[PDB]
């Protein structure tokens, strides 16, 4: 009896509005090609205060339950990974539980480590199940965030917001994860952070890229050693990482995925028993292979390019885009995933796409999620950005979605769309 654990399905929620990234460039006196070619952006989600971390998380989690016909009483863990917390004590997960009218027999809590928080919660849910404690039950892990750098900042064109809700179970139709094979690399850095009382992040941008790549290298190498010992990959005519059908990466901006994939391949090329016969120039040229990027990574960025950085959710939006179109082809094949969070930590893990992944992705109806949005001007984006966090716009949520309506006596109030 082969037991499996992992991601059974997912759902996505996005803010109601977005801007065209070339409009942002023009408003900032920037060449639009810096954003479209340099960063790989197309459209940037923008929010108003009604689209807070709770509202986006609850919209995604409710959509998951409805689209996948989840029995809410089978949920034994509800975890929200976020870096956009709204209370020091009361977790987003508790608000989500209430808004969705979920029953009582579940753990609820939030996880925090920049863009790694969702992955940390995913592993906690997976290992709860794989330990036996969660046998017979499911978990819901929601990655929800709003990425804000501020007007006229270098990070501004990488903003975004939204949520991805993951169903975790013993029927992991999207991704049957290889338990215990993860690689991890973490160290205390100040590449990106956001002190309490600052609405916008602080970042040393180029250093943050170096930190991502450094942590990726350590995490990937740790996974590779375990995968070699488990017989899942080999040092052969193909590099170890080439034996993964696809690799999905944390996407702070779309061009980061190419940088990440080049670095992963360089790890193989530098570590091969015969590396001494190569040069930095020859290794770099091979690592940057357009064929490899096209085969393993390129199709994972379609949703990300239209939304922006959704912090904890960015890797899972890449997984979503990949499986949206390729789940049937990928059934039975092993793929890799690299999660990074500033501060920092990276974790690399693998899993096998399930036979029913295409079914679960069809039910997620992702083009309909993206089609509901409306474009706004940069002027309006700026006006909404300037609103205080307690001042949601007077607009109704979409059917089954949620919005913050007001804060009254320090208690946050929400509405569910009819």
Ligand X SMILES: CC(C)(COP(=O)([O-])OP(=O)([O-])OC[C@H]1O[C@@H](n2cnc3c(N)ncnc32)[C@H](O)[C@@H]1OP(=O)([O-])[O-])[C@@H](O)C(=O)NCCC(=O)NCCSC(=O)C[C@@](C)(O)CC(=O)[O-]
The total of other beta-carbon atoms located within 10 Å of residue 222's CB is 18
259 known ligand binder: yes
In sequence order, the 6+-apart residues with CB closer than 8 A to the CB of 274 are none
115 labelled catalytic:
yes
Pick from 15, 40, 49, 155: which binds ligand X (CB under 6 A)?
Answer: 155
Tokens linked to 331: 């059934």
Give the C-alpha separation, 13 to 403, whole Å.
Answer: 12
Residue 169: enclosing H or E segment and its boundaries? strand 160-169
In sequence order, the 6+-apart residues with CB closer than 8 A to the CB of 293 are 258, 261, 262
187 binds ligand X (CB under 6 A): no
Pick from 40, 252, 302, 308: which binds ligand X (CB under 6 A)?
Answer: 252
Got the DSSP string for 322-372? HHHHHHHHHTT-EEEEEEEETTTEEEEEEEE--TTHHHHHHHH-HHHHHHT
340 binds ligand X (CB under 6 A): yes
Nearest to 192, CA basis, from 83, 283, 294, 98: 83
Pick from 104, 152, 277, 394: which binds its own copies (CB under 8 A)?
Answer: 104
Stretch that binds its own copies, among 33-41, 96-104, 286-294, 301-309 (CB under 8 A): 96-104
33 binds ligand X (CB under 6 A): yes
Does residue 78 sit in helix, strand or coil?
A: strand
185 labelled catalytic:
no
# chain residues binding its own copies, by CB under 8 A? 70
Question: Which 181-210 residues touch its own copies, going by CB under 8 A?
Answer: 182, 184-190, 192-198, 201-202
250 labelled catalytic:
yes
288 binds, among its own copies, ligand X, none (CB under 5 to 8 A by kind): none
137 binds, among its own copies, ligand X, none (CB under 5 to 8 A by kind): none
Selected catalytic residue, list 95, 113, 250, 261: 250
Got the DSSP string for 126-165? HHHHHTTTTTT-EEEEEEEEEE---TT-TTGGG-EEEEEE
Considering beta carbons, is residue 25 or 115 the nearer one to its own copies? 115
The binding site comprises 31, 34, 154, 206, 208, 259
Catalytic positions, written as ranges:
83, 115, 250
Binding site for its own copies (CB under 8 A): 76, 83-91, 93-95, 97-99, 104-114, 116-117, 120, 123-124, 126-128, 130-135, 179-180, 182, 184-190, 192-198, 201-202, 218, 222, 341-345, 347, 410-411
């Amino acid at each position: 009896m082969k037991k499996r654990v992992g991601i059974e399905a997912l759902a996505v929620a996005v803010p109601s509005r977005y801007v065209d990234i070339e409009d942002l460039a023009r408003a900032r006196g920037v060449d639009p090609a810096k954003y479209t070619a340099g960063l790989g952006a197309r459209e940037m989600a923008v929010t108003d205060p009604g689209e807070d971390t709770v509202a986006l998380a609850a919209t995604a989690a409710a959509r998951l339950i409805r689209q996948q016909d989840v029995d809410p009483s089978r949920i034994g863990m509800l975890v929200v990974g976020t870096e956009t917390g709204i209370d020091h004590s009361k977790p987003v997960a508790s608000h989500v539980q209430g808004l969705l009218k979920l029953p009582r027999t579940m753990r609820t809590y939030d996880t925090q480590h920049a863009c790694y928080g969702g992955t940390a919660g995913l592993m906690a849910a997976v290992e709860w199940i794989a330990s036996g404690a969660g046998a017979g039950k499911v978990a819901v892990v929601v990655c929800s965030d709003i990425a804000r750098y501020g007007l006229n900042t270098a990070g501004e064109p990488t903003q975004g917001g939204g949520a991805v809700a993951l169903l975790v179970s013993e029927q992991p139709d999207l991704l049957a994860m290889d338990v215990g094979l993860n690689g991890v690399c973490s160290m205390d850095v100040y590449d990106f952070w956001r002190p309490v009382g600052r609405r916008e992040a602080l970042v040393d941008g180029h250093y943050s890229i170096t930190c991502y790549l450094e942590a990726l290298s350590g995490a990937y190498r740790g996974w590779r050693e375990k995968a070699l010992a488990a017989g899942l990959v080999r040092w052969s005519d193909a590099l170890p990482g080439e034996q993964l059908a696809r690799i999905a990466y944390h996407v702070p901006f779309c061009k980061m995925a190419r940088k990440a994939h080049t670095q992963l391949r360089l790890c193989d090329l530098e570590d091969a028993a015969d590396a001494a016969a190569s040069t930095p120039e020859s290794r770099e040229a091979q690592a940057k292979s357009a064929a490899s990027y096209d085969a393993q990574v390129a199709t994972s960025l379609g949703l990300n390019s239209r939304i922006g950085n959704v912090y904890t959710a960015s890797l899972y939006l890449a997984l979503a885009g990949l499986l949206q179109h390729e789940a049937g082809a990928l059934a039975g094949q092993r793929i890799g995933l690299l999660s990074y969070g500033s501060g920092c930590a990276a974790e690399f893990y693998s899993g096998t796409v399930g036979e029913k992944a295409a079914e679960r992705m069809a039910k997620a109806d992702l083009e309909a999620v993206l089609a509901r949005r409306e474009r706004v001007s940069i002027e309006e984006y700026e006006r909404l950005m300037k609103l205080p966090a307690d001042a949601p716009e007077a607009v109704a949520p979409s059917p089954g979605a949620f919005r913050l309506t007001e804060i009254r006596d320090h208690r946050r109030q929400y509405a569910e769309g009819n």
